[PDB]
């Protein structure tokens, strides 16, 4: 069961090793923002929004 969890953890490590992702990147300083057209503000017929 120690051998087992060391796998699960090690699978996450070697995940990061082989890709070149930095664990800290699962944290955000700069939150991205999605282009405005993909989340529009529009006037429907009655000039309402």
């Amino acid at each position: 069961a120690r051998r087992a969890k060391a796998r699960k953890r090690l699978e996450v490590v070697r995940a990061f090793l082989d890709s070149g992702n930095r664990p800290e990147w699962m944290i955000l300083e700069a939150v991205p923002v999605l282009p405005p057209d993909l989340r529009p503000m529009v006037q429907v017929d009655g000039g309402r929004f």
Binding site: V31, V33, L38, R39, D45, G46
Partner: protein, 1111 residues
Amino acid sequence: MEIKRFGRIREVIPLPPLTEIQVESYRRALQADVPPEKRENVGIQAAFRETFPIEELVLDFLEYRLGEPPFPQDECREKDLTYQAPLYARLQLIHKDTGLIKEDEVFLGHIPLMTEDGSFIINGADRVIVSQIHRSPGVYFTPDPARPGRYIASIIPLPKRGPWIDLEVEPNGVVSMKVNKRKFPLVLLLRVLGYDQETLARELGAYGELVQGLMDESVFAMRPEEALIRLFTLLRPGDPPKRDKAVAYVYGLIADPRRYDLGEAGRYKAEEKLGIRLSGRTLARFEDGEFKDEVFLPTLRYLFALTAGVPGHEVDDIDHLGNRRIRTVGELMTDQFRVGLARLARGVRERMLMGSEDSLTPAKLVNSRPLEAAIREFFSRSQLSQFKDETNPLSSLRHKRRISALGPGGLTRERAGFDVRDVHRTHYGRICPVETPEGANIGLITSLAAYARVDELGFIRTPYRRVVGGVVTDEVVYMTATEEDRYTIAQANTPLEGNRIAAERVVARRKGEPVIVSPEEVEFMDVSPKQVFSVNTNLIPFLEHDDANRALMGSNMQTQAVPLIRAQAPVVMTGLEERVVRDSLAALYAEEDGEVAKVDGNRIVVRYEDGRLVEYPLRRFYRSNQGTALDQRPRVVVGQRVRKGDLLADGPASENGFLALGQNVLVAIMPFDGYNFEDAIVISEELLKRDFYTSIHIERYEIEARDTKLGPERITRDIPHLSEAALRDLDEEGVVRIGAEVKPGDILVGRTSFKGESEPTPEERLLRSIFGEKARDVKDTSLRVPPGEGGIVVRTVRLRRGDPGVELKPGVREVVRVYVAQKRKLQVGDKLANRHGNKGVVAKILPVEDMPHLPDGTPVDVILNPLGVPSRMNLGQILETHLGLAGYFLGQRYISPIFDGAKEPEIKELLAQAFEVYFGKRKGEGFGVDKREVEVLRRAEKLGLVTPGKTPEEQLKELFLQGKVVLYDGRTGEPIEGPIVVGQMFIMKLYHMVEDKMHARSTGPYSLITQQPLGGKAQFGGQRFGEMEVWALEAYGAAHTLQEMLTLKSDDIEGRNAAYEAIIKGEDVPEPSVPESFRVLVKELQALALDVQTLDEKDNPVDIFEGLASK
């Protein structure tokens, strides 16, 4: 013509008022006709007495009143208003310290009223409030699905008026208690109520098993108020347990009859269950400083004695109809009312303890709006407030009698198992077992049995005649499913002499099981067969020959029957067709005896014996929710001497007062060369000729002229670049002229709108520089007609503002509505059906010369293929024809009661009396037998239909008695190699017409974010090519055809625009680029901090944005 009735059952009482569930219920909640003094604390009133009085300064409640409506039902219908009444409430504020008294009557807003037929008008659109079925307040016991010998007990109040509590006895001997999913030992609670260890054995003292197990004095080592704080700990991990706040919590959960209400029903149910009276609808009390339990120990009593063996401790069938109950409309709306009042009180005390504690009134301490919006809400977006079904008058009546197990306070679709949907032994005579929808909602939406009524507690119950000794009384009595189970109840048609039970075996049920028993043993008798079935179901003749699964489609398709201009009542009826028109409050009758003064397509005035000249005007050519002309026509002439209750005008789908959902046609039952295939129907052009299966339809077309930041919108007749042809039917203002013919493309209303920051570009300014016409600044935004629609302009409403009466939503100057009519003949694609579940689409219309016909030259109307019958097992349609044959030659209609109607001998007798008319007429007119009738008879004899060695007339007689007649193909004159079944059948046109459903699109509107085409006919949709379709193309290996559906035809904006140029230019279509919708996917993953990268084979990125996102 003459109307023969069958059936030996003398039905004691009539059908009750079939909207009573909707009218009685509401009026019983308003009481707008009871002198306030004489009102009674139920419904609207009861909510007032609940939320009041508001507590520290104290505001109290005197009385409410209702005013008549600002506008009459029609007025609201036209002007998109609500048919409502003003609600005033007289209040007195008094000061908790000085004796202050102010008293105003403050306006609360408008409550929406219920029309006579039991519906509502909400923003000018009739709607119905569907009763809701739910488990009923009470205490129940149910075996534990884990441990075979232990049983959970459950305590259930009205919804959102208390928490559910379970009393599972754990595997540690001492009993548990669940609340907000928090378990804890029960004893801690009983302590808080003042309980003593001995008065437990003093009361339990039987089950050393657990009576002695429940006791654990780690708890007993406290006074009442001690464990009271002991528990607040257990339900509030973090709140400091001050004795002013712990009493506040439990009280506000278990004794405060202000957020814990067992039903009124819930009192009586657990009352007689646990065998204890009950002060209020409340578990616990606060009386003389501490808590005095009411329910917990009685409940505690039952559960224990069950888990040993005790008598009279049964589990409960939670699906029984003594434990399920109905939230009729009045109750459902009061609930919402108790929620506005609740919010309004949160806001008064707020302004009680801030703003000025002595210079205040009822007037300014109340803001009505929280009430207003709670009502408005229940009526405009509830799941029980439904757009009314007024396709025909039955669809409206069936709606008002519907029953949903779904909704706020009930079941979510996923919540719905089997047991909720099953027919219950107790549905008998209360909820129809046929009328339910096929599909997901099966068994949740159901209908009210025809004789059934919901009592004051909200339980369905059904009538039964009392039989004493062996003789049957006329004393009828309505039983809940619970008292029903007490008796042995014999069947509706057990045979009698006078009022004594003749038979020696009687067919009865005890607790719904079928039992054979002697008449001494019999206590009650069904009232009628009609008492087990829906109203619609009761419209089905020969129901007992129809398999259940298509009686159900026969029931439902009725409500879909389109009102026909030449509509007629069925030649075979059940004896309800008249009541249904009555309660459908669509036909028009006479209020007292008198005489007819005038009569007219528009009004009917009648002089009464009371000297009154009442003038009933006629709702002529009204458009219904579903477009189906709701038209009233007059059925008396000047001078006609009219007794009371006689008819004056026929509603829609009514013919002299019988429900006319379709037309009686001459039906032939045989294959017909393919056009019968798989339920398709073949019809005679003669049906369109004499205007059978023709119906009037109207579509409203609205438009608004609004103030803009770029100018106003003008409703004009001045629309740039348009030819006088394109305007010849518009008045000077831009409205089509009432009485015109409008077809696809035609302007109904010209409208102009100002052009934006695309005021002409160079390409366009220059092009006009050539044509000596400079840029015009307004635009053709007119309202045209959509593809596949059109008709005869019947009417126009023009609402401006600046005119009287009128004021519209902000920023709109004027709105114009134009109603458009269409006469609809039957056509290839429309859907037909008969009351037996037989349905099909008209697939071909032959000219009369091709129709099969009988020897005397008459051609059949309809050819229904026989392959429809055997597997569907709906034989009743077969009887309907045979007796329809007879009636077609004796000029008769018949009334065959359900389950008590015309049997086979009785009809074969009729079929002979008709034979003489059909044939004897012949052998005397100078014509004998025919040569093709003998060739057929040769064949019929081999089949075995006729007795060999018998005269042609003898043998044709024998076939006629069989429903069968000789038939000549009109394409040849040669006979049909066999004798056929020809007869008269009642067959309706359904709401499902090709005209409403043919739609197609080359290209059109698209969707904001996805750039994929919209959906639906009204948007000019595209067709969803879903996952399962994609699979289909995938399996075929149609790569390029799939790619096309995934790019050029949906959202590859480049190659889509690129194609529609290639077609119009005659060049093959361009190979496609990336769907714009995949990009949306990328950017949406970026917005989750995920970096998706298109990569070429050597692993370097590919910019699928062609540099538009790079920097």
